[PDB]
Structures are given as C-alpha cells and as structure tokens.
Design a protein around this ligand. Structure first.
Ligand SMILES: *C(=O)c1ccc(O[C@@H]2O[C@H](CO)[C@H](O)[C@H](O)[C@H]2O)cc1
Ligand SMILES: *C(=O)c1ccc(O[C@@H]2O[C@H](CO)[C@H](O)[C@H](O)[C@H]2O)cc1
Ligand SMILES: *C(=O)c1ccc(O[C@@H]2O[C@H](CO)[C@H](O)[C@H](O)[C@H]2O)cc1
Ligand SMILES: *C(=O)c1ccc(O[C@@H]2O[C@H](CO)[C@H](O)[C@H](O)[C@H]2O)cc1
Ligand SMILES: [Ca+2]
Ligand SMILES: [Ca+2]
Ligand SMILES: [Ca+2]
Ligand SMILES: [Ca+2]
Lengths: 121, 121, 121, 121
C-alpha cells in the first residue's frame, strides 16, 4: 500500500507509488484540513458553498481531493473510495491532487493524509 | 461487507451488520453532509471551529462520525479507518453514531454514506 | 494468518491459532506427503483407491487433510480451500486433522504443511 | 480472479485471465487427478517416485502443476501458492501447465481444477 501527504499548494499533485492496473480493486481513505486561500479550512470533500471558478475537476467541490490515473482526466476522490474499480482503459501511476483553479495554488495551505491500498480481486 | 446511511438526527446510532471479532482488521470509508443544527453542513470530520459542549465523543469535533463496538465507549471514525485494529478487549457489533450532545439530536439534518469491510489477516 | 505442520500420526489433530467466526472468508493451502500405514506417501488429497474402513471423514479419501471448526463435524480440506465460507454459523478454533480410522493413527508417518488466512469479507 | 481446468494433455498449457503485475500478491489452489501415461493418477504435486527424464520444470515432480508468468521459465505450483510474490522482473499473463517431458503429452489424461486470485497489497 501507499501512505503519504497531499499538500494543498502542490499544483502538479503528489505522485504515489500505486500503479493502478486493469482489473485492480483499490481502497482510499483521506483525512485532514486544507484551504484554497481563505483562513478557514475544509476536509477532503472541499467547500460545498464555493462556486466552481474553473477547477481542475468539475465533479468535485473546490478544495476537495481528486486524482489522475496515468493519463486520464481528474477523478473525484473526496473522503476516499471503497473497493473501487476504474473505468475501462484507465491505468497507470496514481497522482493525488488538491482540487483548485489552475495557477492559484500559491496561497494554499494545509494537506490531506491519505492511505491507498489494493484489495483482493 | 456493509453499506448504509447514518442520519445525523439518530441519537441511538445506526447498527451495522459488522460484528468486530478479536484480531479482525477493518476498513471504513464515510462521506456526505450533515448538520448539528445550523443551516451549514459539515463532512464526517465535523465542525473544527465548534466548541465541545458535552459531546458523546470528546476525541472528535461536533458533527463528526464516531462508533461503538459492543459495549465500548465512542471511538473516532471521521472520514474512515484504513486497515484498523481495535484495542484489546474491544469486540461486538459496530454502531455508527453522529457526534453530538445527548438530547439535542432533534434539530439535526443530513447523513453520511458509510462503507465497512473486513480486510485479510 | 497461520502456518504450521500437521503430523499424520496426530490423532487429536493440530489446533491452529485461527478462530473462525460467522461470516469469515478463509483460504487454505496444504502441501506435503503423508501415509496411513503403507510405505508410499500421498498428498493432502489422500489415496483415491483406498476403501473407507470407518474414516473420521466419509466425505474425503483416506490420508486426506480434513478439519474441524470448534466442535463441529469433520470438513474436507484436501489441497485446500479458496475463499471459503462455512455452512451457516459454524464457529470456533480450527483444528487440522489427518483423515484416518480412529485408533489406527499409530503407524502413520509424514505430515502436511498448511497456510490458513482470512480473506476480505 | 480466475477459475478453470488445466488438462494434462495440453502441452501448450492453459492461459488464465490473470495478468501478474509488479507488486501483485496472488493465491493459488489446485485440486484434481491427472496422469502422464500410467493408468494411475496423481495430485497437483505429481509423482514423488518418478525420475526426471527431461521435464519442463526440474524443480517439481512429473505430473505436478507448474506455471509460466509472461516469458519466464517454469515455476512450481503444485497444490498452490499462499499470498505469493513473484521474483523481480517477472510479469505478464499466467499460463498453467502440466509438468511433463516435451513431446510426450499425447498419452496424458485427467485435469486439475484451479483457482487463482489476487490478494490485497
Ligand atoms: C468569494 O466567493 C470568494 C472567496 C474566496 C476565494 O478564494 C479564491 O478561490 C479561487 C477558486 O475559486 C482560487 O483558489 C483563489 O486562489 C482563491 O484566492 C474566491 C472567491
Ligand atoms: C455558539 O455560537 C453556538 C452554539 C451552539 C450551536 O448549535 C448547537 O450546538 C450544540 C452542540 O454544541 C447542539 O448540537 C445544539 O442542538 C445546536 O443547536 C451553534 C452556535
Ligand atoms: C488394502 O489393500 C489395504 C488395507 C489397509 C491398509 O492399511 C491400513 O489402513 C487402515 C485404513 O483403511 C488404517 O489406516 C490402518 O492402520 C492401516 O494399517 C493398506 C491396504
Ligand atoms: C519407469 O518406471 C517409468 C518410465 C516412464 C513412464 O511413463 C512415461 O513417463 C515419461 C516421463 O518420464 C513420459 O511422460 C512418457 O510419455 C510416459 O509414457 C512410467 C514409468
Ligand atoms: Ca488557491
Ligand atoms: Ca443538535
Ligand atoms: Ca493408520
Ligand atoms: Ca506423457
């Protein structure tokens, strides 16, 4: 499995050691507090009251945890995924990213602690 | 494996089908939005800015997800637990509960979608 | 997980540290060579040609690996079990036993090496 | 997870749907009766008394179950493998093969019933 920290100000995202392969079943658990600028902080689900001003992932609130598997587009992770299987043709290294508008990561703070494990399959 | 919702206004708590046994390893994932009264809603980690006014679990914020195992005291769940082992002598059915002051659940709203599974060991 | 040897001459059987609980999914892999008397040896499947002269397990060949969960009847194991679930709520420690006629274990030789682990459930 | 039969007379071997990947942990359980010629039949461990006359796998008895992972050499399987990790660089589809001398599979009979699964990691 993989365990690490995903910083809110890390625009490129945090590359994990998990390489999702076809047929793999994975489980993710995320926790912690982060912010997209304001002094207030939000959990892995982000800010439910903030407008989407061009986030890297439109299927998740601003300040939420999302991911990219290999070359895929962003995928919502939020508080995590339970025994999850990726869509067809989706594979490669897993990168965890804080959901924010491109180019604005500079004033971000906090981070999410995340566990990723492969389940039986 | 168990999946269900935990209503915030349910003071008694949501009983699952999971019976934790000595040596068991479990993984929990929780998501959703709930409130301990205010119009705003918080994730499974609760409101980090709200004071503790006699919560059922002092190890977690008001509005966070907690649990009891058999006759044990409240245990912080928050966003979930990754391949987690219970303390010695802790066993029995797992009951998921919204962290709030007893007798005040009346004005709660929302719920959490929670998954619980047993891992290999 | 549990790993150990099961001697063919051990009539009482080999008690393991595995405590099977209702709902548990288990996997077992047995290997090795043993005999119920003759000079040659057989695998965990036993002797497919030998007649049943009053074996402790009538659902398995003589010289095969069987087991008991708690105080239940014997259960065929053979080469092992793959993600196996018990016949409705059989509970207790797992005892591995060489399949032979009671009171004749005296001239047995060899043993089986066995791994037992609980799977995700 | 894969489940199928491996015929003793299939020299090419049986291709499974299991693609082994770096870091993968797998469990195999094999059962049944097969023969490399004689009218007798042996289990997945083969004939412990038979000499090696040029078997595809010199680390297992004749009549034993073995496998190939991708372009790797033969690897002993016998009754199976418990939470097993492959040697470095070894990866690719898993092909199950009956252990025998090349060009002699003609007079073989029987088969092995095999279950392959991936464990959590
Ligand atoms: C008003 O609704 C408002 C409050 C705070 C805020 O912060 C910016 O949010 C952007 C994303 O929408 C981006 O992350 C900026 O860097 C933040 O300063 C925007 C709007
Ligand atoms: C203070 O400004 C403040 C105090 C309470 C509150 O809501 C109540 O919180 C209680 C827990 O501390 C309990 O859940 C009550 O039922 C809520 O009404 C908001 C703001
Ligand atoms: C017949 O060919 C035959 C009968 C018995 C035998 O050995 C005995 O088998 C018993 C179980 O059927 C028991 O295990 C005795 O202790 C063995 O001596 C071999 C061949
Ligand atoms: C010696 O007692 C003996 C030799 C061969 C035999 O059967 C053959 O075994 C070969 C492998 O060693 C090969 O599989 C042949 O096709 C078999 O006929 C039985 C006993
Ligand atoms: Ca920002
Ligand atoms: Ca309340
Ligand atoms: Ca005997
Ligand atoms: Ca042959």
């Amino acid at each position: 499995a993989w365990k690490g920290e995903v910083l809110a100000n890390n625009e490129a995202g945090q590359v994990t050691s998990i390489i999702y392969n076809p047929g793999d079943v994975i489980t993710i658990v995320a926790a912690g507090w982060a912010s997209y600028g304001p002094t207030q902080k939000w959990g892995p689900q982000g800010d439910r009251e903030h407008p989407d001003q061009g986030l890297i992932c439109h299927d998740a609130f601003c300040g939420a945890l999302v991911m990219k598997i290999g070359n895929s587009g962003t995928i919502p992770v939020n508080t995590g995924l339970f025994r999850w299987v990726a869509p067809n043709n989706v594979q490669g290294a897993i990168t965890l990213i804080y959901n924010d508008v491109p180019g604005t990561y500079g004033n971000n703070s906090g981070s999410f602690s995340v566990n990723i494990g492969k389940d039986q399959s």
